[PDB]
Ligand binder design. Structure first.
Ligand SMILES: COC(=O)[C@@H](N)Cc1ccccc1
Ligand SMILES: COC(=O)[C@@H](N)Cc1ccccc1
Ligand SMILES: COC(=O)[C@@H](N)Cc1ccccc1
Ligand SMILES: [Ca+2]
Ligand SMILES: [Ca+2]
Ligand SMILES: [Ca+2]
Ligand SMILES: [Ca+2]
Ligand SMILES: [Zn+2]
Length: 316
């Protein structure tokens, strides 16, 4: 909507206070004009019709329990925008400052969040498996990274290409989590998962097997569930990315870590220059090797570490 840019204050899902960019015109709206063509957050009102209503508030204070998911969806979309712009010189998900739209309070008891090809959508959770999912910066960044993938590599959401798609979202969701620098880790979804249990998460990059996901190609899932294992076999790629950044010895193969920023540079280049809709795990290895060669040279430590990490997870 047309109005003037303002600054509201509210509390997120975890009870933390933050400022949010709003727009005033009779009401205060969750519309951040400071980033690209805007960030816009909507109320789905417990329904599945999308997007719902642009979020309107009478006083520019967002401290109600109902408000919390909206505050975080809005704020963490901004953080994600800032990561891509400042770290990768990418203007929104399309590279041309596309407006970022999100809806909260999707359905009732919905234990998930997703990019639907056009916008972000967040459930509130059932209160036991999940609390509202926009409370997790890694969740917000995971699903906005699907938008980036859709506009770039276009990885089809099935089998190995789909597992790469998922892993790319877990990798950049994590890198955004580190960028924001609040309790960062190599785990996925911890901030909003199982409020009754400390220290767990939905997936782990550091040890995918913690949650039953493979950490080596020899353990890959070959059946039809989960679109051919897209959230399962992502563990093989997530482990390779973790090893590239952090290092380690895995199934007897030693990897010299090169740190998170180089991991991000290599994988962002691979995603945006070298992956295609049908890329498999072997082709991802090749893309990462070429990306690292472009950036650092064929004889570099960075290239050597990318090779060892894929060796360590059984991907040739
Ligand atoms: C299976 O659901 C998926 O993984 C995402 N749709 C939601 C999610 C992302 C990141 C962390 C937690 C949840
Ligand atoms: C069969 O699937 C399991 O029961 C899931 N909880 C995944 C898992 C497997 C093995 C160990 C830990 C977690
Ligand atoms: C329930 O979803 C799971 O726990 C995921 N970790 C996928 C999985 C299922 C079963 C066995 C292994 C992996
Ligand atoms: Ca208010
Ligand atoms: Ca964390
Ligand atoms: Ca995390
Ligand atoms: Ca928990
Ligand atoms: Zn995903």
């Amino acid at each position: 909507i047309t109005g003037t840019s303002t600054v509201g204050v509210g509390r997120g899902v975890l009870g933390d206070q933050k400022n949010i960019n709003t727009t005033y015109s009779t009401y205060y709206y969750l519309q951040d004009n400071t980033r690209g063509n805007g960030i816009f957050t909507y109320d789905a009102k417990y329904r599945t019709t999308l997007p719902g209503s642009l979020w309107a508030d009478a006083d520019n204070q967002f401290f109600a329990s109902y408000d919390a998911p909206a505050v975080d969806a809005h704020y963490y979309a901004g953080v994600t925008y800032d990561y891509y712009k400042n770290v990768h010189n990418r203007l929104s998900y399309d590279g041309n400052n596309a407006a970022i739209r999100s809806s909260v309070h999707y359905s009732q008891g919905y234990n998930n969040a997703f990019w639907n090809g056009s916008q972000m959508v967040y459930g509130d959770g059932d209160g036991q498996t999940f609390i509202p999912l926009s409370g997790g910066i890694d969740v917000v960044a995971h699903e906005l990274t699907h938008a980036v993938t859709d506009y770039t590599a276009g990885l089809i959401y099935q089998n190995e290409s789909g597992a790469i798609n998922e892993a790319i979202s877990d990798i950049f969701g994590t890198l955004v989590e580190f960028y924001a620098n609040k309790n960062p880790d190599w785990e996925i979804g911890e901030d909003v998962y199982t409020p009754g249990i400390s220290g767990d998460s939905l997936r782990s990059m550091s040890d995918p097997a913690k949650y039953g996901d493979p950490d080596h190609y020899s353990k890959r899932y070959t059946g039809t569930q989960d679109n051919g294992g897209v959230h399962i076999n992502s563990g093989i790629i997530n482990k390779a990315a973790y090893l590239i950044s952090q290092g380690g010895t895995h199934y007897g193969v030693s990897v010299v870590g090169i740190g998170r920023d180089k991991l991000g540079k290599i994988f962002y280049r691979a995603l945006t220059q070298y992956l295609t809709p049908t890329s498999n795990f072997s082709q991802l290895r090749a893309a990462a090797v070429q990306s690292a060669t472009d950036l650092y040279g064929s004889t570099s430590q960075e290239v050597a570490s990318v090779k060892q990490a894929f060796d360590a997870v059984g991907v040739k």
